[PDB]
Amino acid sequence: VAVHVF
Amino acid sequence: VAVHVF
Amino acid sequence: VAVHVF
Amino acid sequence: VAVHVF
Amino acid sequence: VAVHVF
Amino acid sequence: VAVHVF
Amino acid sequence: VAVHVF
Amino acid sequence: VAVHVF
Amino acid sequence: VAVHVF
Amino acid sequence: VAVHVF
Amino acid sequence: VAVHVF
Amino acid sequence: VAVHVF
Amino acid sequence: VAVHVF
Amino acid sequence: VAVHVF
Amino acid sequence: VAVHVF
Amino acid sequence: VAVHVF
Amino acid sequence: VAVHVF
Amino acid sequence: VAVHVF
Amino acid sequence: VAVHVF
Amino acid sequence: VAVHVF
Numbered sequence: 704v705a706v707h708v709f
Numbered sequence: 710v711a712v713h714v715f
Numbered sequence: 716v717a718v719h720v721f
Numbered sequence: 722v723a724v725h726v727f
Numbered sequence: 728v729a730v731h732v733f
Numbered sequence: 734v735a736v737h738v739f
Numbered sequence: 740v741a742v743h744v745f
Numbered sequence: 746v747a748v749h750v751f
Numbered sequence: 752v753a754v755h756v757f
Numbered sequence: 758v759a760v761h762v763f
Numbered sequence: 764v765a766v767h768v769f
Numbered sequence: 770v771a772v773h774v775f
Numbered sequence: 776v777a778v779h780v781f
Numbered sequence: 782v783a784v785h786v787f
Numbered sequence: 788v789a790v791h792v793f
Numbered sequence: 794v795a796v797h798v799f
Numbered sequence: 800v801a802v803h804v805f
Numbered sequence: 806v807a808v809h810v811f
Numbered sequence: 812v813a814v815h816v817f
Numbered sequence: 818v819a820v821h822v823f
Contacts, residue, residue, distance in 0.1 A: 712718045
């Protein structure tokens with residue numbers, strides 16, 4: 704799982 | 710602003 | 716899932 | 722202003 | 728879904 | 734002024 | 740749906 | 746003045 | 752629907 | 758003065 | 764604006 | 770037959 | 776038949 | 782904005 | 788038929 | 794923003 | 800049908 | 806952000 | 812259907 | 818961050 708916030 | 714969940 | 720606000 | 726959910 | 732306000 | 738929902 | 744006011 | 750809904 | 756007032 | 762509804 | 768045809 | 774524009 | 780835009 | 786057709 | 792955008 | 798079609 | 804973005 | 810479609 | 816990002 | 822889809 705990959706969670707990106709940008 | 711971007712939020713991704715993969 | 717991708718959530719974009721711009 | 723744009724909101725996307727994919 | 729894409730919601731645009733401009 | 735334009736509002737789109739697709 | 741597209742709603743235009745101009 | 747113009748209002749469109751499509 | 753298109754409503755024009757001019 | 759003109760009013761159109763189509 | 765209100766357009767009535769009746 | 771009646772047509773109104775207000 | 777009635778068309779309203781408010 | 783409210784567009785009614787009836 | 789009614790279309791609202793608020 | 795709220796878009797209603799009904 | 801309703802679409803909301805808050 | 807909350808996006809509702811219903 | 813609802814999508815939330817907080 | 819909390820991402821809900823339901």
